[PDB]
């Protein structure tokens, strides 16, 4: 979706650029509908930082169909030593399905994130558990 050189420039203010670029490429080379975006992230306390996120869709199997489920994964400037902050991003034609892994704001909660530790944990492994969990219980539904 963007070149390795442009990705490196996007994360110029990151503390661990080579590690963040490598883990990001490892996902966007396989998941072509995820794109790195530089945007202003608002922390829960109202402070903000310009961060790279992955925005787009991941393919999720459900009842023999495959959905392009919209997500946003924010990388903190300490990536990969702290987990990404992850959201389901419903379109105007979707609603969030809440449960133990998804709140009404679309924030994702997983053991993978709670137990995050570099280098056991990585961005590709997070996408893989997200696809397994959402295939069991899709986190968004379209209009009836």
């Amino acid at each position: 979706a963007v070149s390795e050189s442009q990705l490196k420039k996007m994360v110029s203010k990151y503390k661990y650029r080579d590690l963040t670029v490598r883990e990001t490429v490892n996902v966007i080379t396989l998941y072509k509908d995820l794109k790195p975006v530089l945007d202003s992230y608002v922390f829960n306390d109202g402070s903000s930082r310009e961060l790279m996120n992955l925005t787009g869709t991941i393919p999720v199997p459900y009842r023999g169909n495959t959905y392009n489920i919209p997500i946003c994964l924010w990388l903190l400037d300490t990536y990969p030593y702290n987990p990404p902050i992850c959201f389901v991003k419903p379109t105007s034609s979707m609603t969030i399905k809440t449960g133990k892994h998804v709140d009404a704001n679309g924030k994702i909660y997983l053991p993978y994130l709670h137990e995050w530790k570099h280098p056991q944990s990585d961005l590709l492994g997070l996408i893989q558990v997200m696809i397994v969990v959402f295939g069991d219980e899709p986190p968004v539904f379209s209009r009836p």
Binding site: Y67, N68, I69, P70, T91, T95, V140, F141, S142, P144
Partner: peptide
């Protein structure tokens, strides 16, 4: 492609 999701039951 475009975002998609299973239709909510009515």
């Amino acid at each position: 492609t475009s975002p998609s999701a299973p239709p909510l039951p009515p």
